Amino acid sequence: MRLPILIINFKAYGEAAGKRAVELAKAAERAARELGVNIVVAPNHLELGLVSQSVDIPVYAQGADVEAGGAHTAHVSLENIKEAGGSGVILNHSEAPLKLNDLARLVAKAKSLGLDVVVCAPDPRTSLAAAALGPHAVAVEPPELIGTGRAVSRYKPEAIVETVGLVSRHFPEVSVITGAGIESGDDVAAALRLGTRGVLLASAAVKAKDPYAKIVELAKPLSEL
Amino acid sequence: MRLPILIINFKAYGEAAGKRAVELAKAAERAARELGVNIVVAPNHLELGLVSQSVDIPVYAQGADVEAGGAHTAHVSLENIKEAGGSGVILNHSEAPLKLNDLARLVAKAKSLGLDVVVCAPDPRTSLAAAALGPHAVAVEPPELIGTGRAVSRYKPEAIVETVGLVSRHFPEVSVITGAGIESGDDVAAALRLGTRGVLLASAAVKAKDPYAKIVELAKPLSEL
Amino acid sequence: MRLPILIINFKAYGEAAGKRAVELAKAAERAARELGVNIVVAPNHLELGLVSQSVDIPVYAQGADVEAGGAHTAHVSLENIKEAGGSGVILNHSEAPLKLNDLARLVAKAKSLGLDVVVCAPDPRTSLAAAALGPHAVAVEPPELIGTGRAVSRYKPEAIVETVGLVSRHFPEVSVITGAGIESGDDVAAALRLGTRGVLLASAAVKAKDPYAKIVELAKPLSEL
Amino acid sequence: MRLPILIINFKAYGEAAGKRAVELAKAAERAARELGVNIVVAPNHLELGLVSQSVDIPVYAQGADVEAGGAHTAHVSLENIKEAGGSGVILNHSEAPLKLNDLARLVAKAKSLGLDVVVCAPDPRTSLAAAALGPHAVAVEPPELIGTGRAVSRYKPEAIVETVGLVSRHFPEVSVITGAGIESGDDVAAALRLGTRGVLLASAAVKAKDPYAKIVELAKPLSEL
């Protein structure tokens, strides 16, 4: 994955479903080109293939629960993600927690497929544990802040700082990014100043009246540091 | 939902992933128009939106685990399915079993959103319980026969018989379909002769050397009725 | 199981854990003998064997997730419940919802072991589905009321009436009991009056200052009606 | 927990159910006393309280899924384990895999409660992630060898060696034990020579014609190292 990163998680919001998924991805794409910043998009599963074939910025799956293709009705396999045009996958988001054993296999398989992999974790210690699995990045996100507009970088900076320290002490190839409550460019800059290599967010971009303008605001700090 | 139905479940097979999903859906669409039969397609989650916007036959989701849109990363909600262009959803398939309590809620919700709903069950009794929830159809599918090419209509016709009997006795409005091991048109005709209103299959169509031809073979019994 | 029944679910309350489990079961036993009423007790899993060997009233398991003994670390199997001295099992309580497919197998297996089986469901329609599986009894239990003191028989009598009517119309062998919010002898009598053959409760008994006295109050209507 | 340890997991075997749980625990206790070795026992949930009150060797729960007592019908909470007389708990056994996020909270809660905690993992990398959470010990256990009689220490020594290396490299305060396939005193000795501080086994002890004799055989190497 490209260095400083901004990941827009569409979750299952109606504002980003159906065609809106492609519109949102395109606004993200324009912002990435205007700023020369790596902006990644994660649409809901139903739109992953469609979105992947509509934009050129990296498109990540919101999750996966199976390694290979096969008889896994209603499941999301890493191989299918690749075959659909995805460039990476987010695993263990607070809203879709995974079993430690599956997660370990999912991180390895995703990597051997050439997919970027980001593992979320609620706090520093769990982030350390996720980092031991070898993902490209670990996203520390305090679940209490998710959707509140109260940025982790301003309301709970210790969690970011402690994660960066723990991870850099044990598995320094693993990058740390953060999320939960990020709503403005300042929240993003604060994250980077705290040692982060990027940010993960949903609400602020997905629910903005002017997605392109908002995304530019949010991604701008990445093209400054 | 349309009267006699043939549902092709793409599962997570690589042979139906990516662009192949659209190709398979189109072959199904041709067959459907050629025979004047209701052929439905269920691509993997990642290609649902893409497939829905590429064909006019009904496109069903392989499953769902959430009712409404919102902060449900990596989940598939019924509203998102509707927003993606889907017309129905398969629930409780053997490879993705659901809690009875969630199942009762998903069925009702799906119905009010205007989604067709098919609930799978392993045997007659579980199928009877499923039918009590009120789905459009209940699909009796012996898990042992799945993917073996040993058609349920030939190897375990009692399972179809008892299900049609019980459901017609208790919840006559609910239609009964069946699946597992269906490999030929004769298997399909045998299933219909047992009182079924349709069939659910995967292998035979997904792995056929000539999808279109194979699907026509499989669907033909629906038109001959 | 015995005709009119009162089931005290200890859940995981500390007030009923350890030795307290035996103390509570004994107070229940005294009340049962004093009133000539079938009072059943359901301690947490950890105390099931201990309690079973300390009283003579029926002792039910709060749940199970596996049919037979074997390599199932940290699981509760129906055979083990029987070997431990239990006389029955509660399945699909709101706090431990089960997959429909598993629930069906568990009810059948439990009945074949000679165990009493009660299946909970949140509402009438789901209670009907549960009833189709053949348990001895279905316990309609509106989750909104659990632990609130607002008895189901006071605030949602319709739920009881409908469940009773639906079940008696489809599976008359299956009995209907009810639960959630039952706090007094009066809620109990109300329940019986509404067509119920018993009651399921936890808070009122488990948290009573005088268990024996409270249980006598709750069970008393079972001898009257 | 105590230095070199031998944990006998009763799983859900009928041979160790009901009264047999206490019999087995006592045979273990005798062996422990005769050898001056720390032999721990993990009975199925249903017999945990009973066994805890029948022996003085440490009794561990086979698993848990909840932190504190409360309205968690059919669940096993760490507080209830302590209230039942348990000395520790085993988490994430292959037969009961847990979510990383839950695992992190449970490990922390167990230690806070004064309970010993062991986390199982299928391989070195997962064991390393588990060790990041800080349990007293991690038990690398290849799932393919469980119940096969082919000892991990004979058939997959690399798995032990790698785990011991990785864990002592990152979290040296966390101990390593191993399990799966262990059937003889030689397999245990071989495990200890590979850097392990103990062993976890089930079949060999549970299904022995002479439990006491077998357990003495298995535990003997602990008195020699």
Sheet of A5-9, strand order: A38-42, A5-9, A198-201, A175-179, A137-140, A116-121, A88-91, A60-61
Q: Tell me the β-bridge partners of B117.
A: B89
Residue with tokens 């540091």: A225
Picking from B88, B65, B85, B89, the residue whose alpha carbon sits closest to that of residue B77 is B65
Helix, strand or coil, per DSSP, at residue C148 = coil
Neighbours of A (≥3 Cβ pairs closer than 8 A)?
Answer: B, D
Number of residues written out for chain D: 225
User: Does the CA dihedral C40-C44-C48-C52 come out positive or negative?
Assistant: negative
Radius of gyration of chain C (CA): 16
In DSSP notation, D145-171 reads GTTTS--HHHH-HHHHHHHHHHHHHH-
User: Considering only alpha carbons, which residue of chain B is nearest residue A45?
Assistant: B46
Helix, strand or coil, per DSSP, at residue D215 = helix
| C-alpha span between B148 and A122 (Å, rounded) | 43
Nearest to B98 among C100, C128, C132 (CB): C100
In DSSP notation, chain B reads --SSEEEEE-TB-GGGSTHHHHHHHHHHHHHHHHHT-EEEEE--GGGHHHHHTT-SS-BEES--SBSS-BS-TT--BHHHHHHHT--EEEES-TTS--BHHHHHHHHHHHHHTT-EEEEEESSHHHHHHHHHT--SEEEE--GGGTTSS--HHHH-HHHHHHHHHHHHHH-TTSEEEEESS--SHHHHHHHHHTT-SEEEE-HHHHT-SSHHHHHHHHHHHHHT-
Number of residues written out for chain C: 225
| C-alpha span between B81 and D62 (Å, rounded) | 40
Helix, strand or coil, per DSSP, at residue C89 = strand
Helix, strand or coil, per DSSP, at residue D72 = coil
Q: Assess contact for C155 and C192: CB atoms under 8 A.
A: no
Q: Assess contact for A58 and A48: CB atoms under 8 A.
A: no
| C-alpha span between C37 and C30 (Å, rounded) | 10
The three-point CA angle A44-B133-D75 to 5° equals: 75
Would residue A141 show up in a list of annotated catalytic residues for this protein? yes
Helix, strand or coil, per DSSP, at residue C60 = strand
* B122 touches C at CB < 8 Å: yes
| C-alpha span between D124 and D159 (Å, rounded) | 6
| Paired tokens of D192 | 């200890």
Q: Do D46 and C12 touch (CB under 8 A)?
A: no
Q: Assess contact for D202 and D152: CB atoms under 8 A.
A: no
Q: Assess contact for B21 and B203: CB atoms under 8 A.
A: no
Q: Assess contact for C189 and C221: CB atoms under 8 A.
A: yes
Picking from A129, A185, A132, A123, the residue whose alpha carbon sits closest to that of residue A160 is A123
Picking from D182, D217, D179, D184, the residue whose alpha carbon sits closest to that of residue D28 is D217
Q: Hey, what amino acid is at B57?
A: I
Task: Give the total number of structural domains in chain A.
Answer: 1
Q: Tell me the β-bridge partners of B137.
A: B118, B175
Q: How far is A183 from chain D (nearest CA, A)?
A: 25
Q: Fill in the DSSP letter of residue C69.
A: -
Q: What does each C-alpha distance from B70 to A16, A112, C97 come to in angstroms?
A: 10, 32, 23
Residues with Cβ within 8 Å of residue B51, at least 6 apart in sequence = B21, B22, B25, B41, B43, B59
Residues with Cβ within 8 Å of residue A203, at least 6 apart in sequence = A147, A149, A183
Q: Assess contact for B39 and B4: CB atoms under 8 A.
A: no
* B92 touches C at CB < 8 Å: yes
Residue with tokens 């995304």: A215
Q: How many CA atoms lie within 13 A of C59 on its CB side?
A: 26
Would you call B26 exposed, middle or buried from its count of C-beta atoms within 10 A (0-12, 13-18, 19+)? middle
Neighbours of D (≥3 Cβ pairs closer than 8 A)?
Answer: A, C
Q: Fill in the DSSP letter of residue D47.
A: G
Cβ contact D–C (≥3 pairs, < 8 Å): yes
Neighbours of B (≥3 Cβ pairs closer than 8 A)?
Answer: A, C
User: At C23, which helix (H) or strand (E)?
Assistant: helix C19-35
Q: Assess contact for D151 and D199: CB atoms under 8 A.
A: no
| C-alpha span between A41 and D82 (Å, rounded) | 46
Radius of gyration of chain D (CA): 16
| C-alpha span between A32 and A23 (Å, rounded) | 14
Q: How far is A20 from chain D (nearest CA, A)?
A: 32
| C-alpha span between B48 and D73 (Å, rounded) | 38
Exposed e or buried b for every residue in C191-204, given b needs 16+ CB within 10 A?
A: bbebbbbbbbbbbb
SS (H, E, C) chain A: CCCCEEEEECCECHHHCCHHHHHHHHHHHHHHHHHCCEEEEECCHHHHHHHHCCCCCCEEECCCCECCCECCCCCCEHHHHHHCCCCEEEECCCCCCCEHHHHHHHHHHHHHCCCEEEEEECCHHHHHHHHCCCCCEEEECCHHHCCCCCCHHHHCHHHHHHHHHHHHHHCCCCEEEEECCCCCHHHHHHHHHCCCCEEEECHHHHCCCCHHHHHHHHHHHHHCC
Number of residues written out for chain A: 225
Give the N- to C-terminal CA distance of chain A in Å, as an integer. Answer: 17
Q: Assess contact for D87 and A88: CB atoms under 8 A.
A: no
User: Does the CA dihedral D2-D6-D12-D16 come out positive or negative?
Assistant: negative
Picking from D92, D86, D84, the residue whose alpha carbon sits closest to that of residue D65 is D92
| Paired tokens of D165 | 């290396």
Nearest to D126 among A104, A121, A170 (CB): A104
| C-alpha span between D135 and D197 (Å, rounded) | 14
Q: Assess contact for B161 and B221: CB atoms under 8 A.
A: no
| Paired tokens of D218 | 């298995």
Q: Do D49 and C47 touch (CB under 8 A)?
A: yes
Picking from C164, C172, C101, the residue whose alpha carbon sits closest to that of residue B170 is C172
| C-alpha span between A39 and A41 (Å, rounded) | 7
Nearest to C14 among D83, D146, D147 (CB): D83
Q: Assess contact for D115 and D89: CB atoms under 8 A.
A: yes
Q: How far is CA C89 from the centre of its chain?
A: 8
| C-alpha span between B75 and B68 (Å, rounded) | 10
| C-alpha span between A41 and A25 (Å, rounded) | 6
Nearest to B45 among A46, A79, A85 (CB): A46
Name every chain B residue with its beta carbon within 8 A of the beta carbon of C159: none
Q: Assess contact for D45 and D77: CB atoms under 8 A.
A: no
Q: Tell me the β-bridge partners of C60.
A: C88
Q: Assess contact for C37 and C2: CB atoms under 8 A.
A: no
User: Does the annotation list D181 as a binding residue?
Assistant: yes
Q: Do C129 and B133 touch (CB under 8 A)?
A: yes
Q: How many CA atoms lie within 13 A of A31 on its CB side?
A: 29
| C-alpha span between C129 and D143 (Å, rounded) | 37
Q: Do B73 and A94 touch (CB under 8 A)?
A: yes
Q: What's A189's domain CATH number?
A: 3.20.20.70
Q: Fill in the DSSP letter of residue D53.
A: T
Q: How far is CA B14 from the centre of its chain?
A: 19
Q: Do D126 and A94 touch (CB under 8 A)?
A: no
Residue with tokens 């309690």: C51
Q: What does each C-alpha distance from C41 to B7, B106, C49, C218 come to in angstroms?
A: 48, 33, 12, 14
Q: Tell me the β-bridge partners of A59.
A: A41
Q: Assess contact for D158 and D177: CB atoms under 8 A.
A: no
Would you call D147 exposed, middle or buried from its count of C-beta atoms within 10 A (0-12, 13-18, 19+)? middle
Q: Assess contact for D57 and D39: CB atoms under 8 A.
A: yes
Q: Do C133 and B132 touch (CB under 8 A)?
A: no
Q: Assess contact for B79 and B68: CB atoms under 8 A.
A: yes
Q: Assess contact for B17 and B44: CB atoms under 8 A.
A: yes
| C-alpha span between B130 and B90 (Å, rounded) | 12
User: Considering only alpha carbons, which residue of chain C is nearest residue D90?
Assistant: C74
Picking from B6, B8, B37, the residue whose alpha carbon sits closest to that of residue B224 is B37
| C-alpha span between D41 and B128 (Å, rounded) | 44
| C-alpha span between A4 and A37 (Å, rounded) | 8
Q: What are phi and psi of D198, to 5 degrees?
A: 160, -175
User: Quick one: CA torsion of C23, C27, C28, C34, rounded to 10 degrees?
Assistant: 160
| C-alpha span between B180 and A205 (Å, rounded) | 44
Structural domain span for residue A217: 1-225
Would you call C169 exposed, middle or buried from its count of C-beta atoms within 10 A (0-12, 13-18, 19+)? exposed
Q: What does each C-alpha distance from D149 to C116, D11, D145, D152 come to in angstroms?
A: 37, 16, 7, 9
Radius of gyration of chain A (CA): 16
Picking from D133, D154, D153, the residue whose alpha carbon sits closest to that of residue D198 is D153
Resolution of the entry in angstroms: 2.5
User: Does the annotation list D26 as a binding residue?
Assistant: no
Q: Do C101 and B101 touch (CB under 8 A)?
A: no
Number of residues written out for chain B: 225
Radius of gyration of chain B (CA): 16
Q: Assess contact for A100 and D130: CB atoms under 8 A.
A: yes
Q: Tell me the β-bridge partners of C137.
A: C118, C175
Picking from C63, B76, D73, C65, the residue whose alpha carbon sits closest to that of residue A65 is B76
Q: Assess contact for D192 and D225: CB atoms under 8 A.
A: yes
Picking from A193, B158, D48, the residue whose alpha carbon sits closest to that of residue C45 is D48
User: At D34, which helix (H) or strand (E)?
Assistant: helix D19-35
Residues with Cβ within 8 Å of residue B70, at least 6 apart in sequence = A11, A12, A13, B77
Would you call D199 exposed, middle or buried from its count of C-beta atoms within 10 A (0-12, 13-18, 19+)? buried
Q: Hey, what amino acid is at A8?
A: I
Q: Do A9 and B76 touch (CB under 8 A)?
A: no
Q: Fill in the DSSP letter of residue D12.
A: B
Q: Assess contact for C52 and C59: CB atoms under 8 A.
A: yes
When scoring C73, C89, C145 by the number of chain D Cβ atoms within 10 A, the one with the most, hence best to mutate, is C73
Helix, strand or coil, per DSSP, at residue D200 = strand
| Paired tokens of A21 | 């998924």
Q: Where are the alpha helices (DSSP H) in D36-138?
A: 48-52, 78-84, 100-112, 124-132
Residue in A67, A93, A136, A217 annotated catalytic: A93
In DSSP notation, C96-125 reads S--BHHHHHHHHHHHHHTT-EEEEEESSHH
Helix, strand or coil, per DSSP, at residue C138 = strand
User: Quick one: CA torsion of D69, D75, D80, D84, rounded to 10 degrees?
Assistant: 150
Q: Hey, what amino acid is at C5?
A: I
Q: How far is B92 from chain C (nearest CA, A)?
A: 8
